[PDB]
């Protein structure tokens, strides 16, 4: 799901 990618990006960038 493309709509989940920015959540992962957010999580890994913390």
């Amino acid at each position: 799901n493309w709509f989940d990618i920015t959540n992962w990006l957010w999580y890994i960038k913390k």
Epitope: N1, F3, I5, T6, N7, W10, K13
Partner: antibody, heavy 124, light 109 residues
Framework: VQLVQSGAEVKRPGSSVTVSCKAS????????LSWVRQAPGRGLEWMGG????????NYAPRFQGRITITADRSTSTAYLELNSLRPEDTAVYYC??????????????????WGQGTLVTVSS | EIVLTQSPGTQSLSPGERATLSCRAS???????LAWYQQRPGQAPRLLIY???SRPSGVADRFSGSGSGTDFTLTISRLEPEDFAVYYC?????????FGQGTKVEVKR
Amino acid sequence: VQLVQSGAEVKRPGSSVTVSCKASGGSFSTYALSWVRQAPGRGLEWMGGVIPLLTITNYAPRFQGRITITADRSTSTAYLELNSLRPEDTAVYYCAREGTTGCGGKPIGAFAHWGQGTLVTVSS
Amino acid sequence: EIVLTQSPGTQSLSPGERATLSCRASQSVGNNKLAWYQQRPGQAPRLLIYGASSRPSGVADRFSGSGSGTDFTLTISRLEPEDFAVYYCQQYGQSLSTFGQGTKVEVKR
């Protein structure tokens, strides 16, 4: 977050239109920007989106081959290009950015932020 | 492609009344990624509910979302004059996002 779109456009049948969306406030590169259109008297239709940092686009099958969505990190601007225009493409085109929850910037996928819309009229 | 059905397409109700609006999906919506938007004539849509039941801080608490799988509901506990508008559901549980065709909540007289 404020999204400001380019002004109304009249386009000839068979031409291509570019609509711009400039974001001011928050972060631009790490949040999903979509384009949604609404023909006169009709419903919302999701066309596609982009995640700028990763350059990952996602187009609705209905528009795959006719649309290009790009993002310019230097100007926090996203662009919609729609090709081979027909009268049926006459619509208000909105840019829509996903919201956040909490104070940490966690994205929610759903479209909290909307531009003012751009009317594209396809006509001779 | 997930088809979202909003039936009925119009509801005629009185100010102060409760409203329940249905969104039925042709297939299960991934992780209940179902949003509701309000749209008034001449205005951009506005997000009321996301993730089936989450409400953004600014949104009136008379709006609530419920449901899961294929069966979602937007509830307006008491209609204010500004609540007479069009309501769209949207799924974003797969890369192809779709909207319902909308339900217009209009004033019965």
